[PDB]
Amino acid sequence: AISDADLKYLRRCVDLAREALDDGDEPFGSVLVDHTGTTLFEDRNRVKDGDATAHPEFAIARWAARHLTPDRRARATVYTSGEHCPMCAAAHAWVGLGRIVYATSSAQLGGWLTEWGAQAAPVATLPINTVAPGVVVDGPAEELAETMHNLYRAKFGR
Amino acid sequence: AISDADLKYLRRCVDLAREALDDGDEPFGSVLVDHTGTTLFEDRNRVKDGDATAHPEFAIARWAARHLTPDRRARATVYTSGEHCPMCAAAHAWVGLGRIVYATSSAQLGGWLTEWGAQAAPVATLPINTVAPGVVVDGPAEELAETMHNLYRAKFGR
Ligand SMILES: O=c1nc[nH]c(=O)[nH]1
Numbered sequence: 221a222i223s224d225a226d227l228k229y230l231r232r233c234v235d236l237a238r239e240a241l242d243d244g245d246e247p248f249g250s251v252l253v254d255h256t257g258t259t260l261f262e263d264r265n266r267v268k269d270g271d272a273t274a275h276p277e278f279a280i281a282r283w284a285a286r287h288l289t290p291d292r293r294a295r296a297t298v299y300t301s302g303e304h305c306p307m308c309a310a311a312h313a314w315v316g317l318g319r320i321v322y323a324t325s326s327a328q329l330g331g332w333l334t335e336w337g338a339q340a341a342p343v344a345t346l347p348i349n350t351v352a353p354g355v356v357v358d359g360p361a362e363e364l365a366e367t368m369h370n371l372y373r374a375k376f377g378r
Numbered sequence: 379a380i381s382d383a384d385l386k387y388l389r390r391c392v393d394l395a396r397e398a399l400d401d402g403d404e405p406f407g408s409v410l411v412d413h414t415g416t417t418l419f420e421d422r423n424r425v426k427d428g429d430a431t432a433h434p435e436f437a438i439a440r441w442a443a444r445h446l447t448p449d450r451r452a453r454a455t456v457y458t459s460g461e462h463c464p465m466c467a468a469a470h471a472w473v474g475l476g477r478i479v480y481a482t483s484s485a486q487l488g489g490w491l492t493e494w495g496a497q498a499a500p501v502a503t504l505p506i507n508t509v510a511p512g513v514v515v516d517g518p519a520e521e522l523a524e525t526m527h528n529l530y531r532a533k534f535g536r
């Protein structure tokens with residue numbers, strides 16, 4: 221399901237999540253990749269300037285809306301370190317992007333938060349296909365479960 | 379309870395939706411109201427230029443994160459002609475806005491779209507509280523339902 225190439229991109233997402241963490245933001249990174257394997261756009265979380273909606277997948281949906289034809293959007297892939305929240309999953313579906321691949325699920329992150337005693341997000345951790353039934357979704361990647369546990373702990377578990 | 383003040387704001391939302399319809403956009407309008415009864419920001423749907431995520435409730439959330447302190451956001455009210463889609467409900471809860479009042483439910487709109495044989499949105503019509511469990515939500519308003527049915531019919535009927 222997750223190819224070797226798919227892993228390479230998820231690892232790039234983990235590196236963008238790390239840049240975010242190192243810069244004071246939350247550890248989420250995301251990459252948009254055309255059908256050919258060329259990276260079109262990369263972004264990471266930027267909520268530290270006060271806007272909690274500054275999620276990378278959202279910015280990818282809007283970048284694609286402005287710069288890609290619908291046909292090209294349907295055949296592009298979004299890679300993300302963490303599974304799209306409902307905001308990001310709906311935006312993705314609204315603009316007509318294609319396959320999503322995630323390293324860790326929002327269910328896992330949900331679970332990990334409570335284990336540390338951290339406050340739950342005000343947004344439910346709904347799987348992507350509850351929000352967006354038509355989207356092709358792959359993940360998680362078992363290889364990245366430990367790394368993402370560590371990253372998420374660095375930010376949310378003290 | 380939807381009060382008489384609330385209904386006045388919903389009627390302004392219906393007017394903004396009609397402005398969207400006359401401009402060639404989809405009929406959605408929303409208003410952000412301070413706890414003092416002051417209108418702070420007003421917007422409507424702007425998707426015709428090709429960005430399908432140009433929902434007014436989402437513009438409200440970003441304007442609020444930019445312009446209001448967290449505490450002022452929590453005490454302000456968002457009025458909307460149509461119930462927040464999952465993208466907009468999530469954004470609202472991320473930035474920590476308060477009460478939502480809507481004139482017509484996304485369930486009502488979904489049923490109407492099915493009657494017209496209109497193609498269903500790529501985003502599921504989840505109730506606000508499925509996405510954002512902590513938000514106080516009121517509506518629909520029985521008195522504006524037929525009015526919004528007519529505006530929807532103008533855009534989506536066939
Ligand atoms: O930047 C983000 N991307 C997905 N979910 C979340 O809470 N934050």
Ligand SMILES: O=c1nc[nH]c(=O)[nH]1
Nearest residue numbers: 406423433434462463
């Ligand atoms: O502008 C919008 N607001 C709510 N739902 C929708 O499809 N569009």
Ligand SMILES: [Zn+2]
Nearest residue numbers: 275305307308
């Ligand atoms: Zn998100």
Ligand SMILES: [Zn+2]
Nearest residue numbers: 433463465466
């Ligand atoms: Zn919306």
